[PDB]
Design a protein around this motif. Structure first.
Motif, PDB file in Angstrom:
ATOM      1  N   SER A 155      41.631  78.892  33.755  1.00 28.22           N
ATOM      2  CA  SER A 155      40.597  79.885  33.820  1.00 28.22           C
ATOM      3  C   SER A 155      40.294  80.393  35.217  1.00 28.22           C
ATOM      4  O   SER A 155      40.326  79.642  36.189  1.00 28.22           O
ATOM      5  CB  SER A 155      39.337  79.228  33.264  1.00 28.22           C
ATOM      6  N   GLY A 156      39.982  81.682  35.296  1.00 30.91           N
ATOM      7  CA  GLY A 156      39.322  82.223  36.452  1.00 30.91           C
ATOM      8  C   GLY A 156      37.969  81.566  36.677  1.00 30.91           C
ATOM      9  O   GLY A 156      37.517  80.759  35.863  1.00 30.91           O
ATOM     10  N   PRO A 157      37.280  81.928  37.761  1.00 32.57           N
ATOM     11  CA  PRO A 157      37.603  83.020  38.680  1.00 32.57           C
ATOM     12  C   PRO A 157      38.799  82.743  39.583  1.00 32.57           C
ATOM     13  O   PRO A 157      39.094  81.594  39.926  1.00 32.57           O
ATOM     14  CB  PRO A 157      36.336  83.147  39.529  1.00 32.57           C
ATOM     15  N   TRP A 158      39.485  83.823  39.947  1.00 28.85           N
ATOM     16  CA  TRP A 158      40.661  83.754  40.809  1.00 28.85           C
ATOM     17  C   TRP A 158      40.447  84.562  42.071  1.00 28.85           C
ATOM     18  O   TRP A 158      39.817  85.619  42.044  1.00 28.85           O
ATOM     19  CB  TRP A 158      41.891  84.314  40.107  1.00 28.85           C
ATOM     20  N   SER A 159      41.070  84.090  43.145  1.00 26.00           N
ATOM     21  CA  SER A 159      41.040  84.732  44.442  1.00 26.00           C
ATOM     22  C   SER A 159      42.453  84.962  44.954  1.00 26.00           C
ATOM     23  O   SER A 159      43.408  84.306  44.543  1.00 26.00           O
ATOM     24  CB  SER A 159      40.305  83.875  45.456  1.00 26.00           C
ATOM     25  N   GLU A 160      42.541  85.826  45.934  1.00 23.12           N
ATOM     26  CA  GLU A 160      43.806  86.280  46.489  1.00 23.12           C
ATOM     27  C   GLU A 160      43.722  86.284  48.003  1.00 23.12           C
ATOM     28  O   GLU A 160      42.713  86.666  48.565  1.00 23.12           O
ATOM     29  CB  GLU A 160      44.033  87.660  45.916  1.00 23.12           C
ATOM     30  N   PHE A 161      44.752  85.776  48.680  1.00 24.46           N
ATOM     31  CA  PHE A 161      44.761  85.675  50.134  1.00 24.46           C
ATOM     32  C   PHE A 161      46.178  86.026  50.605  1.00 24.46           C
ATOM     33  O   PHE A 161      47.149  85.706  49.933  1.00 24.46           O
ATOM     34  CB  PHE A 161      44.413  84.247  50.574  1.00 24.46           C
ATOM     35  N   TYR A 175      43.236  94.082  64.311  1.00 18.36           N
ATOM     36  CA  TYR A 175      43.748  94.236  62.974  1.00 18.36           C
ATOM     37  C   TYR A 175      45.176  93.756  62.858  1.00 18.36           C
ATOM     38  O   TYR A 175      45.999  94.015  63.739  1.00 18.36           O
ATOM     39  CB  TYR A 175      43.623  95.708  62.537  1.00 18.36           C
ATOM     40  N   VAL A 176      45.459  93.093  61.737  1.00 18.26           N
ATOM     41  CA  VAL A 176      46.821  92.715  61.335  1.00 18.26           C
ATOM     42  C   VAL A 176      46.959  93.045  59.851  1.00 18.26           C
ATOM     43  O   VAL A 176      46.103  92.666  59.047  1.00 18.26           O
ATOM     44  CB  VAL A 176      47.131  91.222  61.589  1.00 18.26           C
ATOM     45  N   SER A 177      48.030  93.730  59.487  1.00 19.12           N
ATOM     46  CA  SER A 177      48.272  94.018  58.088  1.00 19.12           C
ATOM     47  C   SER A 177      48.396  92.738  57.291  1.00 19.12           C
ATOM     48  O   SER A 177      49.054  91.795  57.719  1.00 19.12           O
ATOM     49  CB  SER A 177      49.561  94.821  57.964  1.00 19.12           C
ATOM     50  N   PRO A 178      47.826  92.709  56.078  1.00 24.22           N
ATOM     51  CA  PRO A 178      48.051  91.546  55.210  1.00 24.22           C
ATOM     52  C   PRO A 178      49.474  91.472  54.665  1.00 24.22           C
ATOM     53  O   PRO A 178      49.869  90.455  54.121  1.00 24.22           O
ATOM     54  CB  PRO A 178      47.055  91.762  54.068  1.00 24.22           C
ATOM     55  N   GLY A 179      50.237  92.546  54.835  1.00 18.76           N
ATOM     56  CA  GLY A 179      51.567  92.596  54.302  1.00 18.76           C
ATOM     57  C   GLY A 179      51.569  92.647  52.791  1.00 18.76           C
ATOM     58  O   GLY A 179      50.517  92.791  52.157  1.00 18.76           O
ATOM     59  N   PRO A 180      52.753  92.554  52.191  1.00 20.29           N
ATOM     60  CA  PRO A 180      52.872  92.728  50.749  1.00 20.29           C
ATOM     61  C   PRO A 180      52.610  91.482  49.921  1.00 20.29           C
ATOM     62  O   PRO A 180      52.494  91.600  48.709  1.00 20.29           O
ATOM     63  CB  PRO A 180      54.324  93.190  50.585  1.00 20.29           C
ATOM     64  N   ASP A 181      52.601  90.290  50.521  1.00 22.65           N
ATOM     65  CA  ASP A 181      52.689  89.033  49.762  1.00 22.65           C
ATOM     66  C   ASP A 181      51.349  88.332  49.682  1.00 22.65           C
ATOM     67  O   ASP A 181      50.570  88.338  50.650  1.00 22.65           O
ATOM     68  CB  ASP A 181      53.756  88.135  50.394  1.00 22.65           C
ATOM     69  N   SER A 228      59.402  76.169  47.274  1.00 22.08           N
ATOM     70  CA  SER A 228      59.763  77.452  47.856  1.00 22.08           C
ATOM     71  C   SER A 228      59.395  78.561  46.885  1.00 22.08           C
ATOM     72  O   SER A 228      59.324  78.349  45.675  1.00 22.08           O
ATOM     73  CB  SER A 228      61.274  77.484  48.119  1.00 22.08           C
ATOM     74  N   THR A 229      59.179  79.748  47.429  1.00 20.71           N
ATOM     75  CA  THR A 229      58.968  80.960  46.655  1.00 20.71           C
ATOM     76  C   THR A 229      59.673  82.126  47.333  1.00 20.71           C
ATOM     77  O   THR A 229      59.700  82.196  48.561  1.00 20.71           O
ATOM     78  CB  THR A 229      57.453  81.270  46.473  1.00 20.71           C
ATOM     79  N   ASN A 230      60.228  83.039  46.548  1.00 18.23           N
ATOM     80  CA  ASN A 230      60.851  84.240  47.081  1.00 18.23           C
ATOM     81  C   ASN A 230      60.047  85.466  46.657  1.00 18.23           C
ATOM     82  O   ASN A 230      60.048  85.836  45.480  1.00 18.23           O
ATOM     83  CB  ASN A 230      62.309  84.344  46.607  1.00 18.23           C
ATOM     84  N   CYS A 231      59.341  86.047  47.621  1.00 19.51           N
ATOM     85  CA  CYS A 231      58.525  87.239  47.401  1.00 19.51           C
ATOM     86  C   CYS A 231      59.266  88.455  47.921  1.00 19.51           C
ATOM     87  O   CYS A 231      59.186  88.758  49.114  1.00 19.51           O
ATOM     88  CB  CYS A 231      57.195  87.112  48.143  1.00 19.51           C
ATOM     89  N   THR A 274      53.631  89.752  44.865  1.00 24.43           N
ATOM     90  CA  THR A 274      53.968  90.667  45.921  1.00 24.43           C
ATOM     91  C   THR A 274      53.867  92.114  45.498  1.00 24.43           C
ATOM     92  O   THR A 274      54.150  92.454  44.330  1.00 24.43           O
ATOM     93  CB  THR A 274      55.393  90.384  46.469  1.00 24.43           C
ATOM     94  N   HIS A 275      53.483  92.966  46.438  1.00 30.24           N
ATOM     95  CA  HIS A 275      53.548  94.406  46.244  1.00 30.24           C
ATOM     96  C   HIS A 275      54.972  94.944  46.376  1.00 30.24           C
ATOM     97  O   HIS A 275      55.251  96.044  45.928  1.00 30.24           O
ATOM     98  CB  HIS A 275      52.662  95.117  47.276  1.00 30.24           C
TER      99      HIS A 275
END
Ligand SMILES: [K+]
Length: 114
Positions: A57-63, A78-84, A6-9, A100-101
């Protein structure tokens, strides 16, 4: 490292399945669904932020990390990616972190999920 149970964002709790679904969505570049607009993209690690990656090590990606994923969006539908976000190692698919943002120093900043 291993995907956590589990994670809490910032109050959005996601499961290991949610995280795996995000990474697999990011990695799905085979023809049918389309890949989402703008994602995955390179993850930029900010020196002033305090994000700890567990994948080396990188490279790193974000989804985007969303419920009932994977995230999809296009300019036409369109759908917002949201903060997480999930961060993963671009070449290996290894899990690195969830961030998270929500609660960040500014609108574009990140803080680590717990
Ligand atoms: K695809």
């Amino acid at each position: 490292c291993d995907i956590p149970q589990s994670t809490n964002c910032g109050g959005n709790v996601y499961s290991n399945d949610d995280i795996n679904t995000a990474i697999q969505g990011a990695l799905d570049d085979v023809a049918x669904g389309d890949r989402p607009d703008n994602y995955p993209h390179q993850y930029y690690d900010e020196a002033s932020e305090d994000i700890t990656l567990c994948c080396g090590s990188g490279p790193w990606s974000e989804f985007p990390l969303v419920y009932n994923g994977p995230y999809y969006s296009s300019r036409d539908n369109y759908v917002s990616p949201g903060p997480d976000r999930v961060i993963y190692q671009t070449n290996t698919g290894e899990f690195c972190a969830t961030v998270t943002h929500t609660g960040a120093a500014s609108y574009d900043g990140f803080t680590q999920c717990s």
